[PDB]
Design a protein around this ligand. Structure first.
Ligand SMILES: [Ca+2]
Ligand SMILES: [Ca+2]
Lengths: 132, 132
């Protein structure tokens, strides 16, 4: 009886993902994920980014665990790690913009936008799986 | 008899721009611009970027003075200055990619791609105007 991820979480490449059914502001989304020992999703591979971008298209704009709330124009994941050069290609054309006003990052369409953190959007949690 | 820019060069915001009629590889484009005391275009304002992106759409993919030939994934203008955070929004979705293989930057459509430097593309030169 191999259970890769908890009930209603999805396994992808050694991690477990939870796709919210409701919409919350960015900070509340962060908190929701911490409630289940997880983090508002931190993207770390292209296959992961591809899967979360597709899934998120079916619901609508969706938060990820990325923001420049600490220092404008510097984007940090919720675990404090820096956004790598190779991931900057995921930004949509024209993003990030409205710097200092739109401080949190969302999947929008086929890439990332920065958006106003107070907006309510879907969100995704990620934590490690338990292998079999 | 006020002449803002030399013959067949276009004035925009204190600078003079030359739009090639032929296509050259990136290095040859750099050299062409140096022949006329100019530089393969270094973008320094949004109004400038807007104007060069529109004009370049009418001809086809066009080189700008930007490349990561010195150090992969670090993009420097031809005068050695670094690419600012605010200009990274000009990259098309999915760019820059093919890192280390596509080392020079072009206007493509409505944003920037990195491309193989050996390809022949149009190009644009920029130098200071002489005020009146
Ligand atoms: Ca935005
Ligand atoms: Ca490319």
């Amino acid at each position: 009886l191999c259970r890769l991820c908890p009930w209603d979480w999805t396994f992808l490449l050694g991690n477990c993902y939870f796709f919210s059914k409701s919409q919350r502001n960015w900070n509340d989304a962060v908190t929701a994920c911490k409630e289940v020992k997880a983090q508002l999703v931190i993207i770390n591979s292209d296959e992961e980014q591809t899967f979360l971008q597709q899934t998120s298209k079916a619901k609508g704009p969706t938060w990820m665990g990325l923001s420049d709330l600490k220092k404008e124009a510097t984007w940090l994941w919720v675990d404090g790690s820096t956004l790598s050069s190779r991931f900057q290609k995921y930004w949509n054309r024209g993003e990030p913009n409205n710097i200092g006003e739109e401080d949190c990052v969302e999947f929008a369409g086929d890439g990332w936008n920065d958006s106003k953190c107070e907006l309510k959007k879907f969100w995704i949690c990620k934590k490690s799986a338990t292998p079999c």
